[PDB]
Amino acid sequence: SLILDDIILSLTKTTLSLLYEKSKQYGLSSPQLQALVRLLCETSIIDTVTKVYIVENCFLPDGYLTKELLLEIINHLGTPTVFSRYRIQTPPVLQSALCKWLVHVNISSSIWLHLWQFSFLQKWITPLVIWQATTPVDVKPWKLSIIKRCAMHPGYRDAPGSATLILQRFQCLVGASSQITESIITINCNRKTLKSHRNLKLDAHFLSILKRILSRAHPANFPADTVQNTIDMYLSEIHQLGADSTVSLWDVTSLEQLAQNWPQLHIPNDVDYMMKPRKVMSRDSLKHLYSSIILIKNSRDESSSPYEWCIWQLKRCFAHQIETPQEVIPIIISVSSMDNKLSSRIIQTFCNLKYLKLDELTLKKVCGGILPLWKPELISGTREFFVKFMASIFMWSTRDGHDNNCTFSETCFYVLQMITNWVLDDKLIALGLTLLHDMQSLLTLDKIFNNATSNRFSTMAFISSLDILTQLSKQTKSDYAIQYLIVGPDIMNKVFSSDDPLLLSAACRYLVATKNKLMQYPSTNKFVRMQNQYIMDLTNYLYRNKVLSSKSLFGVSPDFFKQILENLYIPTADFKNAKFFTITGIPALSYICIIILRRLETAENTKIKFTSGIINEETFNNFFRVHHDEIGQHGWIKGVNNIHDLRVKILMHLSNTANPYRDIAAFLFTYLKSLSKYS
Amino acid sequence: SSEKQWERIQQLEKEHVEVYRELLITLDRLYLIRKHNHAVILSHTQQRLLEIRHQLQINLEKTALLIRLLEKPDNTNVLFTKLQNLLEESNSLDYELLQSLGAQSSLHKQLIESRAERDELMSKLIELSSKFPKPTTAGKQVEVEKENETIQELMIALQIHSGYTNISYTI
């Protein structure tokens, strides 16, 4: 702000406090920082404790540090010598604190290295010369000679450990400049002083102050999270130190460079370095785009270097050759999620039983990274191959005897996402829909998806398939066949019999969508009466309580359904044949209706609570019998006098925007003339 | 020792439901074979209805003695509290499933549009890269570059160590 440099020009007690508070509120600009350090260094009337308090509490940059600020600072870090006596000596504690503040925030590398020979600066120059050395060509034997000469020099304190840290960084960086580990051996072998040097503190209170100031500073220029990440990685680089006419692709540093020398660009065969992963532009600044640049410079074919690299590093992951099979798997996924030829090659060479046996976790990850984006090149033969692959993985999962193994279901969810991507395009939609029907056939087999050994993975895959069917049925512009929206009766009645409320909601959603599509179709076809059978069976099982009077329920005649009720003892025989065949009698929706009833009691602040833990006609009648005079006046849900009205009031609460059970309420409100007015 | 009791009754109920399911399957196929002579080659459309009648018998029994225990709240038997614990952990996670599924489906749509954009970009850049033309003493040059490096480093050393008050990036 203008208050800061106004105080600065005034200084050319109250001004100090104003400068402190305006720095704590705004922070100085780079010319303001230049003027402040120029005023602070040149004069000596200001107290030294106030000088270090300023450099530790007042210098707060707002944006980029310009080169002129560094050049002005470097002018003040010098010492009086035999060729310069007119300038006064800057206090060494002020120089050390300024270098520490620099830690807090090819020529310049030599500038900082020649300042490293100062004894009092060595405790803070070392992170700067570590962070300056980012490339192998930066180091040189003259730098090594100077570092060793000053390290083994007597009269110093921090030189051995810190210079050993510098040499360790150089050894970790270049792998050249003939061996210098024996030079490290010549320097101290205590592993204690450089152990304390390798972790450095930056006064995290001041870091938080600068964090809040910089967050108050420019939008989309230094956000807080990236600043914290950059500071953390700069500290971790210190921490983990224990262990010409044509232009190469490495030396390209900016997007401007690629333009004028694209026909003069030489792509190197250094695939491992450029595929395996900073304010300075260097070779690693543009490492993201290298994989695409190779496939642009060399025309796409199944012989290019990134394709071979992905294939080899995936075979290494499958063969348990790599120590960490989670550092290159995201790289392979990011490269091969696009670029259809590589993904199709990976699918052809890896999606089978043989590589499933080797490692199913990495196969599951590559199926999550490749399958949802794949679009086939040859339509014929894809369906048979995918049926073979899904059958192989299903036998592999089911021979184990453990129903917890969810790899088949997870890969099924992935291939339903592939079917989503396929049916988003109007072409090859029949292949995707037939593959969806095959997946529905595999998901509903009673080896993983049972009524005793549950598997919510299979239910998630099934409701994903039903969601994709509902989203497919809303597309009028695509002239798909009518037979590809039914899944047969044998799946629908089975999943109606299943006790999963989300799955029943998805089934009701599928019925609602397919009827709204089938309304324009003729009223008497092979599948219209099939949908009519579906909705009449589901409505009879859900609301009507007329199962025994029907011809059949889910393909089963009600005589067997009654004979199961025979020899099935119930403690009270008031209403046995209609007690538990309703919305409150469904195994997945029994206690849900009780939760909804309790929430309705809580919302209306009713003094009466439904003490019985089951909603049926007998319990409803007994509940009105025990508290008749209280029910008659006030203290319960309004507008309800019978069990049917209670079910309607429950259905109102299930239609609210708070539950994942919208579709059952809409199904009952749609195909019931009594409930058609509640839509 | 109560946790041991709950663990024990857990594998007992797992083996119980397993043996009852396979017992029902064996009983129904035994009825099929005893009514026939050797008819065991029944189609998928019949095995599925066998699975359907198994499933409805299972959940009908579950609801049947769900009627027996939850009709009158005794609030003293520990099996009762086991039922409320099981129910309250069953119905808790229902919304988050559909929320995560919808969010990841929107993510998949983002993948689809990003892939389409990158396919277009690669197509355009392959078309452009085929239109560019093909790609096409130094003894004193390396010596004068070495001389430049030595002179500039000596200049840096003389500017720093002599206390000269204007350090600048001199090319």
Partner: peptide, 15 residues
Amino acid sequence: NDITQDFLNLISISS
């Protein structure tokens, strides 16, 4: 198609 559907029916029988 028919061979694939019969193969799925074989899976269902084998399940």
